[PDB]
DNA sequence: AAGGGTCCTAGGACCC
DNA sequence: AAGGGTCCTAGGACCC
């Protein structure tokens with residue numbers, strides 16, 4: 001029943017990538033820019049008040065020296081993300097990706113294998129690597145403590161390999177399920193790691209100050225919960241199961257109430273190859289003219305290049321748009337003879353276009 | 368490029384099943400009844416005017432002696448259907464099911480293997496089994512003719528095994544793709560088979576009298592086509608690709624126009640185990656009372672029994688309803704602890720019920 | 735008042 | 751005027 005899960009979360013991911021390619025940007029407050037948004041920044045820039053997802057206007061207002069590099073093309077970040085996932089896959093094959101810079105690994109089989117190689121002597125010598133959440137005391141006679149400490153040791157090897165082999169720093173969190181691993185990985189956050197022993201699980205979930213900090217409780221779910229007088233984790237822990245069910249759904253309810261107790265039986269999923277390939281362009285209604293075709297052609301070339309280099313081929317294409325004021329989309333299957341190119345593909349999309357501040361294309365249904 | 372496909376289609380399937388279990392019902396006009404609908408009938412009953420999908424009222428008006436057996440529980444038909452598919456799977460593993468009584472098999476690899484065992488002597492001795500569509504003359508020096516005749520020979524073995532091993536008769540159609548195999552299988556229809564040589568493909572598609580007879584052109588697509596002045600297969604063959612595209616979709620258009628030429632590159636799919644498990648009950652608004660729970664409990668017991676006997680377990684449940692006057696449905700994931708029962712499951716469904724002439728339950732998302 | 739199936743679509747909620 | 755992802759849902763079109 002008892003699992004040992006690790007959650008890995010890279011430091012200022014995009015900024016770290018740019019800092020690696022241009023070693024200079026180190027020691028200097030660095031922001032990575034996407035249109036008007038400083039999507040992230042390195043930790044220098046955070047000392048000087050810059051925050052993640054901050055308008056470029058406010059970002060300089062706080063840091064007029066902030067160096068900005070453009071991060072609208074994700075290619076280099078996407079490439080590093082998969083190098084990280086591939087490296088962790090060497091440790092244990094079942095690695096679940098979450099976004100570009102997080103990975104879960106179920107270390108359970110691994111922890112168990114390392115224990116069978118030890119004796120009663122080695123067992124009393126087992127030590128933690130990194131922080132223990134809430135400064136909790138360890139009990140070496142507690143098998144669960146021993147296994148989570150072995151997890152912490154695997155997590156440090158992972159982070160060390162990530163640095164030695166890819167030049168990347170990040171955090172790790174080790175716990176008994178994915179929810180808790182992800183919540184504990186951020187407790188000590190610049191390039192460090194934390195392990196959560198079970199006795200401190202309630203301290204961890206009650207350290208949160210609003211329910212949206214629970215992975216799985218988003219903007220909409222949070223809004224509906226405060227509208228019911230639910231604000232703290234304990235409020236959600238103690239709320240009526242029935243009212244919850246019959247307010248936002250038996251699905252949402254029974255799951256986010258379980259989460260509110262630190263419970264989560266979800267398995268670590270093997271993410272494997274991507275399920276989709278998309279690109280976007282945003283603009284200040286900078287498209288009013290069906291010559292919008294050009295934007296779509298540009299998105300095409302990139303996507304076709306990424307697909308070709310993947311190796312599989314998609315069987316569905318989708319076009320997404322946003323109208324000034326809530327996105328809309330039209331998809332259609334891809335014809336057989338095309339699947340084995342620009343000219344046919346753009347004609348497809350323009351008809352999907354004409355059937356209907358942002359333009360996007362998605363290739364999915366990959367085989 | 369060139370395939371040899373077989374399409375198998377059982378005679379008066381439900382009626383045949385009932386006739387087997389109760390050998391008496393043979394020689395007697397037999398109708399299988401579902402509420403007010405004689406869903407099918409044996410061929411005796413068809414001589415006397417009974418037709419498939421005919422009200423029981425009209426069915427006796429034509430045949431006041433018509434014996435009727437109730438076919439609302441599909442269990443025995445479902446069981447035979449899979450015995451048929453399993454038998455054809457012995458011939459070639461990739462068998463595609465369509466409904467309960469049709470199967471496609473790609474005989475291409477099989478045909479080719481049998482040819483390599485023959486010599487120029489055996490090649491001039493190759494004969495057809497069954498009918499040749501349109502009485503077309505065979506050219507033994509035509510490799511395509513030879514391969515489709517070998518297909519016709521495999522199709523006769525299949526039908527013979529189906530009879531010797533399962534007591535079931537049906538038709539087969541052999542052609543170069545699934546569309547044409549399915550259209551030619553019905554040309555000689557009580558327990559016979561037909562092979563389509565390529566020179567007669569246009570004769571086959573133009574033998575149809577309305578476009579809805581094309582598999583893939585349904586009620587809605589047909590209605591929209593007649594509304595555009597499209598009525599014959601040739602009308603659809605010759606219609607504007609552009610207008611078609613921009614009237615019902617690049618998907619629907621480019622595909623049903625291809626079909627209208629007898630073209631179809633769709634592969635034979637391995638259907639394998641079912642993707643869902645559902646049951647239904649219909650009634651003359653015989654449910655106005657949330658004691659509708661009982662109907663749902665009854666559907667449950669059966670579905671739980673079928674699932675348990677399958678071996679896999681579902682991860683989604685769905686409830687469907689129809690209101691007097693266009694169906695509606697609510698689904699939700701299945702909780703982990705239940706998946707490994709009646710009481711929890713019915714409570715799930717009643718809340719899905721209350722969130723909302725027919726009641727149905729579906730188990731899908733099987734793992 | 736059939737009684738089943740397969741697969742696609744537009745959208746939505748969540749994650750980073 | 752971010753720029754990406756994963757997965758679910760209610761419905762719809764088709765097949766028998």
Ligand SMILES: Cc1cn([C@H]2C[C@H](O)[C@@H](COP(=O)(O)OP(=O)(O)OP(=O)(O)O)O2)c(=O)[nH]c1=O
Pocket residue numbers: 009010011012013014015039040041052053099100101189750753
């Ligand atoms: C949340 C989020 C992340 N990202 C990108 C940029 C981030 O570098 C990357 C990972 O996001 P985060 O891990 O959430 O932030 P971070 O890695 O940049 O900084 P931290 O050290 O606190 O973890 O994903 C977006 O582009 N948009 C978003 O809304």
Ligand SMILES: Cc1cn([C@H]2C[C@H](O)[C@@H](COP(=O)(O)OP(=O)(O)OP(=O)(O)O)O2)c(=O)[nH]c1=O
Pocket residue numbers: 376377378379380381382406407408419420466467468556737766
């Ligand atoms: C088309 C159809 C079939 N069925 C069932 C009953 C049929 O026995 C079975 C197969 O249908 P069909 O093969 O279309 O008809 P049939 O097999 O009964 O008669 P035939 O010899 O002409 O092929 O599926 C329905 O219940 N409802 C329907 O709408």
Ligand SMILES: [Ca+2]
Pocket residue numbers: 009010101102750
């Ligand atoms: Ca992160």
Ligand SMILES: [Ca+2]
Pocket residue numbers: 009010011012013101
């Ligand atoms: Ca991060």
Ligand SMILES: [Ca+2]
Pocket residue numbers: 376377468469766
């Ligand atoms: Ca049939």
Ligand SMILES: [Ca+2]
Pocket residue numbers: 376377378379380468
């Ligand atoms: Ca039939």
